[PDB]
Amino acid sequence: RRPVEKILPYVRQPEEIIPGIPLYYATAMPFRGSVRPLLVESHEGRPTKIEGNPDHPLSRGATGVFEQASLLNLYDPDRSQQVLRKGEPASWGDFVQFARSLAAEAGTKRLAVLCEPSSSPTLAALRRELERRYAQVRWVTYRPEGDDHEALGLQQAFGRPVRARYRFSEARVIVSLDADFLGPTDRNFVENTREFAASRRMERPEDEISRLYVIESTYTVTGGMADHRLRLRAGDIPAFAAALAAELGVGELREAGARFAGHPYVVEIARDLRAAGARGVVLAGETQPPAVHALCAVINDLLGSLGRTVILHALDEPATAQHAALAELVQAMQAGAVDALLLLNVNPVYDAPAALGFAEALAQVPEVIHLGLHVDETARRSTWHLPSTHYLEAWGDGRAYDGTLSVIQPLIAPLYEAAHSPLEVLALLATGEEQSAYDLVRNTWRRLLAGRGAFEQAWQRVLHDGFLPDSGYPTVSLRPNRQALADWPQAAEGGLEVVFRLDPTVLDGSFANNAWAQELPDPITKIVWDNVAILSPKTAAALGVKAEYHKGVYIADVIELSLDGRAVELPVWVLPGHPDDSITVYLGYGREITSTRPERKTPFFDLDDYTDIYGHGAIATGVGVNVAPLRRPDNTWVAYGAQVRKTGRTYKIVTTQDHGSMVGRPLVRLATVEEFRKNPDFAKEAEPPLEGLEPWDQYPTLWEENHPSKQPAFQDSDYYRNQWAMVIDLNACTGCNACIVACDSENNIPMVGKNEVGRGREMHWLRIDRYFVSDEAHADDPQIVVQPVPCMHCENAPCESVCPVAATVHSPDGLNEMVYNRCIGTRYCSNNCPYKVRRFNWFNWVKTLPIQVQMAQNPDVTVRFRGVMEKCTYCVQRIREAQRQANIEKRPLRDGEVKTACQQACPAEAITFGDLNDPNNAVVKQRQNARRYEMLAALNVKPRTSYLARITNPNPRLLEQ
C-alpha cells in the first residue's frame, strides 16, 4: 500500500562531504550596511540551520533573530523564478545580449544605482572599475530608514568618518539616550549584548554591575532589561541631553534643555558618570538630530572613556547623506540626464517618502533595471527586473560591523535558473560577459590580502576560518575639541510624535515573506502579523481608543494618521510605557507581494485556508499597512503633524501572551543588589521548604524505595552517565527573541496564520512571555521582565504519568522526551502541565507545505502529523548525534561538544546547558550559584533547567526618588 519512495545518490561523488552527516560551512550575513558572521550546518550541501562563528571574537559563536529567518528567506516561495521585463516574465537569454550591447558600446551612459549599502571591498572596488568607464555614477547608498545617523553625527565630531564598537565589559554605567544597543534592529547586536551581559552577570553574592540609566522616547527592549527607565518624547531628547551636560560640566548648553535643571534622573546620573571615568558610557540612539551624537562624542571623550567606547576609523565613507543624493538623483531623472537605474536589494517604491519623489521619476526613465529578491512594487513598475540570488550564492565579500573582513562560503547552487547575483551583474555592466564571482572576487584579494601566505594557503584559510584575522580598522584618538555644537534649535514641538522604529523581527520590510520572523512575537508586546501603533493609556483615554477584548483576542480601534495629505490607518494598541503624544509605528508589514503559485483551492469539505498560509497568496500581502512613505526625510525617524481621526474598520489584532502583569506571583521575583547582598537565599524565600523538611529539589515523594531512579530499567542505558539540564542567566535575557527561532529551525516546526493564532494556538515551543511589575500600580512604572520558558523536563513530571498511550517517559538524563509517533491527540498531556508548553499539531500544516520550504526542515528530526503533541525536548537531536558519537568511541561528552539552539543562538550567554553531574561544566557553576531560581518549584515537581532570577540594580539615593 505504501509508496516505493526511491533514493537517488550521487553520480560524481564530491570527496569531502558525505551523505548522512552534515558539515559546517562558514558564511557571513549582510544587512543594514554590515555583515554579521555565521556558521551553517549544510546537510549534504543543503543549508538547514545557521549557527555562530565561535572563532570570530566579535560574535564568539552567536546568532540573533535576524539571521535565522534569512535562512528561510533563502528557501521562500515566490522569490524570483523568472526574469521579469516590463512586468512580463519573458526571458533571460535576450537580456544578456541586450544588456551586454548596452554596456560595451555605451560611452558616458549616465547610469545610477541606488544600492544596498556596500560594506564590502569587491563592491566598492568594482564601483571604481565601473566608474572608470561611465562618467558620473551618482552612487547613493539608500540606507534603510535613511542615514544611519550614528555616523553622520561623528564625521564632524572627529573631523573624519568613524564607527564605534562599545565594549561594555570594561564599562559599567551606561546612559543609553534612546540607544537600542541591545536591540536586534541595531547593528553589532552581539558585542553590545555579550560584554553588557557579562557586566550583568554576577556569579557572586555581590559584584560591580552596569546600572544603566535609559531615557528612551519609545519603550524598547533595551529599556526592559534595564534600571531607572524614563519616557520622554523624541525630538526633545536633544533638550534632555542639553540640560544633561550642563549638570556635568562640558558647557553652558542651558537654553536647549531649558526645563531640566534639577530633574532627578539627570542630576542623579551626572555625579555618577564623573565619579566613574574609566567605566561610564554615553550612547545615543537613532531618533535624533546628529548634534546628539556630537554630544555622544563630546561628553564621552570628556568623560575619559575611550578604551570603553572603542572607536574605529572607516574606509573614508562619510558621504551617506540621504537628502544630498536621493533628491539629487531624481533631480537628474526629471531632466533626462540619467538613463539607467540599477537597483540591487531594495524596495524604494515601498520606501522613499513622497516628500522627495521617487515613483514620479521612476516612470519617467526607461532602461530601468531592478535586481531584486522579491517582486514587490518595483519589479512591477520597472522595464527590466533581474532575479537576485541571496547571499548564499554570491561569493560575496563583506565587512563585519566596524571590524574584521569576512567572506561568504556559497553553499548551494542557484536554486532557480538564472539568478545572476548582484556583484557579477554589477560586473556584467563592466562591458564583459558575466564574471565568475569565484574568480572575480579573488582578483581583489591579491591587491588587499594583507597576508604573506598565498591564496591556496590563505584563501583556503579565510574561507575556512570565516574571518580575515588581522583586519579591524585602526583606532582613532580624541579629535573633538567642541566643534559640533551648532545644530540645537531643531528641538521643535507642537504636535503628535509619529516616530518610526524597526521591530527586531523585520528590517525595513526586506524580510517580510519570512514566517519564522513574521510569526515571531515582538519582545515588547507579543504581536504578530500586523504593524501597530503603541502609546500611553493617558493619550488613549485622552484620544478615545482602546485595546478591548471580550474574547481574549484584542479587538482594536484605529488612528487614520494624516501627514501632508498622505494618510493611512492601522490598529492602535496600548502599552503603559510610552510617553505623551508619541507612537512607534513599526515598518515592514505592508509589502505587497505577487505570487506565481496558485491559491490552491480544495473543496469546502477540506480545510486549506486556515492551514495553507502560503495559499491565498505569498505572505507579505495585506499583513498590515505600509508606513514608510509618510515621513519627512529630514531626521527621517521622527515626524510631526498627524491629524488623527478615530475611524472604523476596527478589526482584530492577535498575540500569544494575550495579557500581562502577574498578580504579585512567584514567576520572576526581581531583587536588588541591596536585597541580594542581604539574602542570597531569596529564590527559595518566595516559596521556601517546609517546617523542618528537606530543601526543595531532591525532595522525597511518598515513594523512595520503589522510585524508578532506584530501579534498573530507567537506570540501565548508555545515558545515565550525564544528566542534562539547562539554566538561564535571566539577568541577561531581554527579548532578543532568537532563543525561539533556532528552536524552530533545529527542531523543525510549521508556522501559523493570523486567522489561526487568533484562537490562541501558536506552534512556538519556547514561550518568551513578558511580564509587568509596578509598585501596586503606584505611578504606572512598568519595569518589565522577560523570561523564556521551555518544558522544564521535570522528574515528577505529571505529563509523563498521564499519556495512556505511552508517548511520554522520563527518558534517562532528565530528558522527558516526547515521541511524535505514539501520541494520539487527547491533549491531556498538556492540560496537566503548569507550563502549557506541550504544544499540539492541531492542523496538518506540513501537508500543505510547498515544494520550496521543504528544503529547510532539517533532515535529522521527526516532523509531525496532525493529532500529536510536541515540546522543547532540550534540542535532543544534537544530544543524540553526540552521545551516539560517544557510543562509537569510548568517551564522555565535553563541556561544549553539544550546544542547544536556545544556547547557541542566544548571544547573551544566558543558557549554558552542560550536563548535570559533571562538575567542571558551566551548569554546575551556574546551578550552584545562590539564585538557582526554580520556577514554580512549590508543586514538588523537581525539574531541570533550574534557572536564575534577575537582579535589577537600582541606585543609591543621590536624589534618585
Residues lying near ligand SF4 in the complex (CB under 6 A): 733-739, 742-743, 746-747, 765-766, 768, 786, 788, 790-794, 797-799, 816, 833, 835, 837-838, 871-875, 900-902, 906, 908, 910
889 binds, among ligand SF4, ligand F3S, another protein, none (CB under 5 to 8 A by kind): another protein
Comparison of 323 and 551: residue with beta carbon closer to another protein: 551
* Residue selected from 432, 688, 834, 954 as contacting another protein according to rule CB under 8 A: 834
Rule CB under 6 A: say whether 104 interacts with ligand F3S: no
Comparison of 360 and 716: residue with beta carbon closer to another protein: 716
Q: Is 646 exposed, middle or buried (0-12, 13-18, 19+ CB in 10 A)?
A: middle
Residue 424: how many other CB atoms lie within 10 Å: 24
| Dist CA 409 CA 39 (whole Å) | 9
Comparison of 603 and 712: residue with beta carbon closer to another protein: 712
Beta-strand (E) ranges in 391-435? 397-399, 405-407
* Residue selected from 474, 565, 692, 919 as contacting another protein according to rule CB under 8 A: 919
Q: How far is the CB of 658 from another protein (least distance, A)?
A: 5
Rule CB under 8 A: say whether 465 interacts with another protein: no
* Residue selected from 342, 803, 901, 935 as contacting ligand F3S according to rule CB under 6 A: 803
Rule CB under 8 A: say whether 23 interacts with another protein: yes
C-alpha cell at 154: 561623528
C-alpha cell at 463: 574561507
Q: Is 827 annotated among the ligand-binding residues?
A: yes
739 binds, among another protein, ligand SF4, ligand F3S, none (CB under 5 to 8 A by kind): ligand SF4
734 binds, among ligand SF4, another protein, ligand F3S, none (CB under 5 to 8 A by kind): ligand SF4
Rule CB under 6 A: say whether 805 interacts with ligand F3S: yes
- Output b/e per residue, 130-156; b: 16+ Cβ within 10 A: beebbeebbbbbbbbbbbbbbbbbbbb
- The residues, ordered by sequence, that sit 6+ positions from 526 with a Cβ below 8 Å of its Cβ are 655, 656, 657, 658, 768, 769, 770
Q: How far is the CB of 796 from ligand SF4 (least distance, A)?
A: 8
Rule CB under 8 A: say whether 831 interacts with another protein: yes
| Dist CA 887 CA 961 (whole Å) | 60
Task: Report strand pairing: 28-31 vs 34-37.
Answer: antiparallel
Rule CB under 8 A: say whether 700 interacts with another protein: no
Q: Is 296 annotated among the ligand-binding residues?
A: no
Q: Residue 314 in contact with residue 154, Cβ under 8 Å?
A: no
| Dist CA 661 CA 728 (whole Å) | 21
Q: Is 466 annotated among the ligand-binding residues?
A: no
Rule CB under 6 A: say whether 551 interacts with ligand F3S: no
Q: Is 739 annotated among the ligand-binding residues?
A: yes
803 binds, among ligand F3S, another protein, ligand SF4, none (CB under 5 to 8 A by kind): ligand F3S
Q: Is 753 annotated among the ligand-binding residues?
A: no
Name the segment binding another protein (CB under 8 A); options: 162-170, 189-197, 866-874, 914-922: 914-922
| Dist CA 480 CA 482 (whole Å) | 6
* Residue selected from 13, 21, 542, 688 as contacting another protein according to rule CB under 8 A: 21
Rule CB under 8 A: say whether 767 interacts with another protein: yes
Rule CB under 8 A: say whether 9 interacts with another protein: no
Rule CB under 6 A: say whether 337 interacts with ligand F3S: no
Rule CB under 6 A: say whether 829 interacts with ligand F3S: yes
DSSP 228-242: S-----TTSHHHHHH
Instruction: Scan residues 638-667 and list those touching another protein (CB under 8 A).
Output: 656-662, 665, 667
Residue 789, SS3 per DSSP: strand
Comparison of 221 and 491: residue with beta carbon closer to ligand SF4: 221
Comparison of 490 and 826: residue with beta carbon closer to ligand F3S: 826
| Dist CA 51 CA 903 (whole Å) | 11
| Dist CA 339 CA 329 (whole Å) | 11
End-to-end CA, the chain: 75
Residue 164, SS3 per DSSP: strand
733 binds, among ligand SF4, another protein, ligand F3S, none (CB under 5 to 8 A by kind): ligand SF4
Comparison of 154 and 730: residue with beta carbon closer to ligand SF4: 730
Name the segment binding another protein (CB under 8 A); options: 264-272, 499-507, 830-838, 948-956: 830-838
Q: Residue 849 in contact with residue 863, Cβ under 8 Å?
A: no
Q: Is 115 annotated among the ligand-binding residues?
A: no
| Helix residue ranges per DSSP H, 449-573 | 455-465, 515-518, 537-543
Comparison of 225 and 803: residue with beta carbon closer to ligand F3S: 803
Q: For Cα atoms 597, 602, 603, give the angle at the middle one, nearest 5 degrees.
A: 160
Rule CB under 8 A: say whether 22 interacts with another protein: yes
| Helix residue ranges per DSSP H, 45-112 | 65-68, 70-74, 93-104
Comparison of 407 and 786: residue with beta carbon closer to another protein: 786
Rule CB under 8 A: say whether 721 interacts with another protein: yes
791 binds, among ligand F3S, another protein, ligand SF4, none (CB under 5 to 8 A by kind): ligand SF4
* Residue selected from 59, 808, 873, 946 as contacting ligand F3S according to rule CB under 6 A: 808
Rule CB under 8 A: say whether 500 interacts with another protein: no
177 binds, among another protein, ligand F3S, ligand SF4, none (CB under 5 to 8 A by kind): none
Cα separations in angstroms, 584 against 251, 548, 588: 33, 20, 13
Read off the amino acid at residue 77: P
* Beta strands across the sheet bearing 467-468: 397-399, 405-407, 467-468
Instruction: Scan residues 29-68 and list those touching another protein (CB under 8 A).
Output: none
Phi first, then psi, for residue 732 (nearest 5°) are: -120, 80
Q: Residue 818 in contact with residue 723, Cβ under 8 Å?
A: no
Q: Is 823 annotated among the ligand-binding residues?
A: yes
Q: How far is the CB of 51 from another protein (least distance, A)?
A: 13
C-alpha cell at 263: 530633574
Q: Is 726 annotated among the ligand-binding residues?
A: no
705 binds, among ligand F3S, another protein, ligand SF4, none (CB under 5 to 8 A by kind): none
Q: Is 897 exposed, middle or buried (0-12, 13-18, 19+ CB in 10 A)?
A: middle
Question: Containing H/E element for 30?
Answer: strand 28-31
Cα separations in angstroms, 860 against 719, 816, 844, 856: 20, 19, 20, 11
875 binds, among another protein, ligand F3S, ligand SF4, none (CB under 5 to 8 A by kind): ligand SF4
- Output b/e per residue, 936-956; b: 16+ Cβ within 10 A: ebeeebbbbbbbbbbbbbebe
Cα separations in angstroms, 836 against 576, 791, 810, 854: 27, 9, 18, 28
Rule CB under 8 A: say whether 891 interacts with another protein: yes
Name the segment binding ligand F3S (CB under 6 A); options: 163-171, 797-805, 842-850, 903-911: 797-805
Rule CB under 6 A: say whether 797 interacts with ligand F3S: no
Rule CB under 8 A: say whether 892 interacts with another protein: yes
Name the segment binding another protein (CB under 8 A); options: 123-131, 219-227, 678-686, 714-722: 714-722
Per-residue DSSP letter, 571: B
* Residue selected from 97, 706, 920, 961 as contacting another protein according to rule CB under 8 A: 920
Q: How far is the CB of 780 from ligand SF4 (least distance, A)?
A: 25
Q: Which residues bind ligand F3S (CB under 6 A)?
A: 802-803, 805, 807-808, 823-829, 869
Q: Which residues bind another protein (CB under 8 A)?
A: 15-16, 18, 21-24, 549, 551-553, 656-662, 665, 667, 712-713, 715-721, 759-760, 767, 769, 771, 789, 831, 834-836, 881, 885, 888-892, 917-920, 936, 939
